[PDB]
Amino acid sequence: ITGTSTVGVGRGVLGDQKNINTTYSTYYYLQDNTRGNGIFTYDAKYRTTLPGSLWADADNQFFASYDAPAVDAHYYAGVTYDYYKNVHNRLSYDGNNAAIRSSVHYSQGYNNAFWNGSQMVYGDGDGQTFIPLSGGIDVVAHELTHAVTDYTAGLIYQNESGAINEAISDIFGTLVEFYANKNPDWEIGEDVYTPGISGDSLRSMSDPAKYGDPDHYSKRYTGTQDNGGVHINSGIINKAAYLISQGGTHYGVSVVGIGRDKLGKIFYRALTQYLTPTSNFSQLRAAAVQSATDLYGSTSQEVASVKQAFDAVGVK
Ligand SMILES: CC(C)C[C@H](NP(=O)(O)CNC(=O)OCc1ccccc1)C(=O)NCCCN
Ligand SMILES: [Ca+2]
Ligand SMILES: [Ca+2]
Ligand SMILES: [Ca+2]
Ligand SMILES: [Ca+2]
Ligand SMILES: [Zn+2]
């Protein structure tokens, strides 16, 4: 909407106060004009028709329980925008400052979030398995990263290409979580998962097997559930990424860690310069090796560590 840029205040899903960029024109709207061609947050009103209505508020204060998922979807989309721009020189998901749109309060009891080809969508959860999913910065960044992937490598959402697609979203979701630097970890979704159980998460990148996901190619799933295991076999790549950054010895193979920033540079370059819609795990290894070679040199520790990490998870 046309209006003037304003700054509102509210509380997110976890009860934390934050400022949010809004737009005033009769109402205050969740429309942040400070980033690209805007970040826009919508109310889906417990229904499944998208996007719903651009979020309107009478007083620019967002402290109602119903407001909390919108506050966080809007704010964390801004953080994710900032990460891609400041760290990777990428302007929004399409590289040309496309408007970023999210809808919250999608459906009833909806234990998921997704990119629908055009926008992000967040359930409220059922209160037992999930609370409103925009409360997780790693979740928000996971969803926006699906848009980045779709505009770049275009990884098809099934089998190995789809597991790479998933891992890319978990990797950058985690790197955004570290960028914001509030309780960062290598776990996925911990801030919104199972409010009655402490210390768990939906997936672990440091130890995928903690939740039954493979940490070695010899343990890959090859059935048909979950689009051929896209959220399962992602553990193999998540583990490789974790090892590149943090190091370790895994199934007897030692990996020298090179840190998160270099992990992010290598995988961003692989995603945007070398991967294609049908890339498999072996082709990802080659893409990451070439990316590290471009950035750091063929004789570098960074290249050597990429090779050891993929060796450690059984990907040649
Ligand atoms: C990070 C977690 C919290 C959420 C994540 N959701 P996602 O991967 O983005 C689910 N996207 C998905 O299916 O895209 C396919 C698709 C394409 C076009 C239109 C619609 C959909 C996930 O890991 N879901 C697994 C189940 C959670 N109960
Ligand atoms: Ca209000
Ligand atoms: Ca965390
Ligand atoms: Ca996390
Ligand atoms: Ca929990
Ligand atoms: Zn995903």
What does this 3D model show about the protein?
It contains 8 helices and 15 strands. The protein is an alpha+beta fold and 316 residues long. It has 2 domains: 6-154, Elastase, domain 1 (Roll); 155-315, Neutral Protease Domain 2 (Neutral Protease, domain 2). The strands form 4 sheets. Strands 4, 5, 6, 9, 10 and 11 form a 6-stranded mixed beta sheet that branches. β4 (31-32) and β5 form a beta hairpin. α1 packs across α2, α3 (159-180) crosses α6 and α6 (260-274) packs across α7 (281-296). The longest helix has 22 residues, at 159-180. The radius of gyration is 19 Å and the shape is globular. Bound molecules: ligand 8KK, calcium ion (CA) (4 copies) and zinc ion. The PDB classes it as hydrolase. The entry lists the keywords Inhibitor, Phosphonamidate, Protease, hydrolase. The assembly is monomeric.
Strand coverage percent:
15-25%
Number of strands: 15
Architecture of the largest domain, CATH level 2? Orthogonal Bundle
How many structural domains can be distinguished in the coordinates?
A: 2
Q: DSSP helix count?
A: 8
- State the CATH superfamily name of the largest domain: Neutral Protease Domain 2
How many angstroms separate the termini?
51 Å
Active site: 143, 231 (proton donor)
Cofactor: Ca(2+); Zn(2+)
Keywords: Calcium, Hydrolase, Metal-binding, Metalloprotease, Protease, Secreted, Signal, Zinc, Zymogen
Family: Belongs to the peptidase M4 family.
